[PDB]
Design a protein around this ligand. Structure first.
Ligand SMILES: Nc1ncnc2c1ncn2[C@@H]1O[C@H](COP(=O)(O)OP(=O)(O)CP(=O)(O)O)[C@@H](O)[C@H]1O
Ligand SMILES: [Mg+2]
Length: 333
């Protein structure tokens, strides 16, 4: 099996940390991330090694700053190329509330501050429009959903209050019943759906009416490749499912999916039964976590001393995911 690739990324201090005069307890070198314990400075700092340790604590003027472009060119680009090979792929952002999950996955729409999802979509349509072999034609379908307190809402159709039911097809696996699946033929169109979708996510008074720290957003693309050949006249089809996930803060019930995800990751790392069905998230993502898919985790980290316990926990869960291996033959030309 192909190992689930893992990257961790530390962001600059935020308003909260600055108001408390937080010092940085995170260091990076190569693919290694080290964390210092602010309360017990007498211990030896704990180090963790990953596929990538992104230092984004400073600002783009730094030669060592890990940009949106590097984060995408490393893992995003790799997954898209796998989609083109015909493999199902998944990228999920994990981490404590405010560590930088949405920035990494969505980013902002200016200043080349766009995250993994916008860059991958753009890259996808660019590659498709660069095609010169008329025997190839493409189809791109998108779906966008939110999972909040186990409830699933269609973000591309906030015009229906149905809490869509997650089901298990008798033969083809889990799916969200009646979740809208829209055909898109340009990056501009997909971006427009992404934008309105982002506008439909649940907010929380508790988060100063900002998007609720407890909702999960799953962005799916169904990429179909059709290859003709004037001959026998059969068109062959290659279908890849791209799942881009932005999880709720790691710190019918509020934290079921996240706690269950932790258990699934731990169990998989150990095994190499798994409670996939214990939550809607782990259920829908069953094949991406141990199944037929190329998967990657990007763990967001706060650099502040005040978030030590939470950051250590994220690093430890990212270390375990690194141990997961999914289960995913041509002729010499
Ligand atoms: N690599 C980076 N470089 C510069 N700023 C970053 C950054 N990563 C995150 N930020 C900033 O840090 C703040 C918090 O990040 P963000 O809102 O994306 O976190 P998050 O999605 O983990 C919160 P929640 O758990 O509630 O969903 C934002 O103001 C964001 O722009
Ligand atoms: Mg977020």
């Amino acid at each position: 099996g192909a190992s689930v690739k893992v990257a961790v990324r530390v962001r600059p201090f935020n308003s909260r940390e600055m108001s408390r005069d937080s010092k940085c307890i995170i260091q990076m070198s190569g693919s290694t991330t080290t964390i210092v314990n602010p309360k017990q400075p007498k211990e030896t700092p704990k180090s963790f090694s990953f596929d990538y340790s992104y230092w984004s604590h400073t600002s783009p003027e730094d030669i060592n700053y890990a940009s949106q472009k590097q984060v995408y060119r490393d893992i995003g680009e790799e997954m898209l190329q796998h989609a083109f090979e015909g493999y199902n792929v998944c990228i999920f952002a994990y981490g404590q509330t405010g560590a930088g999950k949405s920035y990494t996955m969505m980013g902002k729409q200016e200043k080349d501050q766009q995250g993994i999802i916008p860059q991958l979509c753009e890259d996808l349509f660019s590659r498709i429009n660069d095609t010169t072999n008329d025997n190839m034609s493409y189809s791109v379908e998108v779906s966008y959903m939110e999972i909040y307190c186990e409830r699933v809402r269609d973000l591309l159709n906030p015009k229906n209050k149905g809490n869509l039911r997650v089901r298990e097809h008798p033969l083809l696996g889990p799916y969200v019943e009646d979740l809208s699946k829209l055909a898109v033929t340009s990056y501009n169109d997909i971006q427009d759906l992404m934008d309105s979708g982002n506008k439909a996510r649940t907010v929380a008074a508790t988060n100063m009416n900002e998007t609720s720290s407890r909702s999960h957003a799953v962005f799916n693309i169904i990429f179909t490749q059709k290859r003709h050949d004037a001959e026998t006249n059969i068109t062959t089809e290659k279908v890849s499912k791209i799942s881009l996930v932005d999880l709720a803060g790691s710190e019918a019930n509020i934290n079921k999916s996240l706690t269950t995800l932790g258990k699934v990751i731990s169990a998989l790392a150990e095994m190499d039964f798994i409670p996939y069905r214990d939550s809607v998230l782990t259920w829908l993502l069953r094949e991406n976590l141990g199944g037929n898919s190329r998967t990657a985790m990007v763990a967001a980290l706060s650099p502040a001393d005040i978030n030590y316990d939470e950051t250590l926990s994220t690093l430890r869960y990212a270390d375990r995911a690194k141990q997961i291996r999914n289960t995913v033959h041509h002729h010499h030309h």
